[PDB]
Design a binder for this molecule. Structure first.
Ligand SMILES: CCCCCC(=O)O
Length: 402
């Protein structure tokens, strides 16, 4: 970080054509949002951030008197110091990493996992040219392995050759007493694979289900793998690799996919109908948004910035970008027309998720044998997350521990 005291601020990184800058101004004026980033308060708490410390972090960010790229956007304090998003979140990470040295075992481990998450959030949404975020992502990764090393649970980092690079994946096991059923898990384009420790700790592990995390192409450890129309590519290779991994029962493999991670799992559940025993997706952009250019052009700048990054765009034309993403729809690709899959897929999203409509999940569910879509209604978002996850583990319990 010392080399990055004056690093270029996140919201200013992505270059847009002047006609596209004019569209961004329209969007910003119409939505009037107080933050550049889409704030995921409830998601981050669900993942393990303490609500009180998160508010303290967000308050120091929003209260700052330091100069912002755009004063409308509270999280755009420029440079690595008080008020900066990366700076303030990394501070919380370092505080966990401090408490970790004065704990041992089952607390030290958990403190480091907490730290990892804070560092990941510090880098969110992980724009590729973001110097502060790159460093945050390094800390996120080193903290995860240090937590893993301290845990009573077993976490192995695998490197699986594929196309002259290696796919980096994390295998979480309760033990190695016998080969265990396993779920391959991927989150969306602005998460890191290390952001799902509680999925394993609080849910999968209680059933001795191993968790194997993977980054989608262009994301995290898979940054060097271009996001193409065959975006399930890396998961298929990781699936084919499970035969050589004796710690897992390759006859009992499932898939969990959040956001765009969900598209890849569905894709895979049509491609490998014998090897995949169960699939569950939450909040996946199956078709609707991808196929709506007019909706893509009206998205907050943070989403367009993430898209430009993952697609390796140097300079962005929004109209062109919006037209290009249609190819990512699983309907446009032909997976949702006639062919059924033997894989039972449970497909959920929260009520009124504009990224994942019930209609999207209904499509998927129909083309799955013993499949099922759900529109999760709840009073709070946390309750929706928790219901969804309870339904997920039951599905995996029923189909994987069969
Ligand atoms: C805006 C929809 C595209 C991104 C979905 C994701 O976060 O994975």
């Amino acid at each position: 970080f010392v080399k990055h005291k004056q690093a270029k601020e996140t919201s200013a990184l992505t270059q847009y054509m002047p006609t596209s800058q004019s569209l961004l101004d329209e969007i910003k004026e119409k939505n009037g949002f107080s933050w550049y980033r889409n704030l995921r308060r409830l998601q981050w708490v669900w993942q393990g951030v303490d609500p009180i410390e998160q508010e303290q972090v967000l308050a120091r960010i929003a209260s700052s008197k330091h100069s912002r790229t755009d004063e409308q956007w509270l999280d755009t304090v420029m440079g690595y110091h008080s008020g900066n998003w990366a700076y303030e979140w990394t501070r919380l990470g370092m505080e966990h990493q401090k408490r970790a040295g004065e704990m041992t075992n089952e607390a030290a481990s958990e403190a480091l996992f907490s730290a990892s998450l804070c560092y990941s959030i510090a880098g969110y949404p992980h724009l590729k040219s973001d110097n502060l975020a790159i460093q945050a992502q390094v800390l996120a990764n080193s903290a995860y392995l240090e937590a893993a090393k301290k845990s009573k649970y077993i976490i192995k980092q695998l490197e699986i050759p594929f196309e002259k690079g290696k796919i980096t994946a994390h295998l979480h096991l309760t033990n190695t007493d016998k080969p265990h059923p396993v779920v391959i898990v991927s989150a969306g384009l602005d998460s890191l694979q290390t952001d799902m420790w509680r999925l394993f700790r609080d849910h999968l592990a209680k059933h001795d289900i191993a968790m194997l995390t993977v980054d989608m192409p262009s994301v995290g450890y898979s940054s060097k793998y271009p996001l193409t129309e065959d975006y399930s590519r890396l998961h298929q290779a990781v699936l084919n690799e499970l035969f050589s991994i004796p710690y897992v029962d390759h006859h009992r493999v499932g898939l969990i996919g959040f956001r765009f991670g969900g598209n890849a799992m569905v894709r895979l559940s049509f491609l490998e109908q014998e090897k995949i025993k169960a699939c569950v997706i939450l909040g996946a952009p199956i078709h609707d948004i991808f196929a709506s250019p007019q909706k893509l052009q009206q998205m907050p700048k943070m989403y367009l910035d993430v898209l430009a990054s993952r697609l390796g765009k140097s300079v962005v034309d929004i109209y062109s970008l919006s037209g290009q993403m249609a190819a990512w729809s699983l309907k446009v690709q032909g997976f949702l027309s006639s062919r059924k899959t033997k894989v039972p897929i449970l497909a959920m999203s929260l009520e009124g998720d504009p990224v994942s409509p019930y209609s999207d999940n209904q499509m998927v569910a129909f083309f799955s044998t013993y499949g099922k879509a759900k529109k999760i209604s709840s009073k709070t978002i946390t309750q929706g997350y928790e219901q969804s996850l309870d339904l997920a583990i039951k599905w995996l319990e029923d189909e994987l521990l069969r």
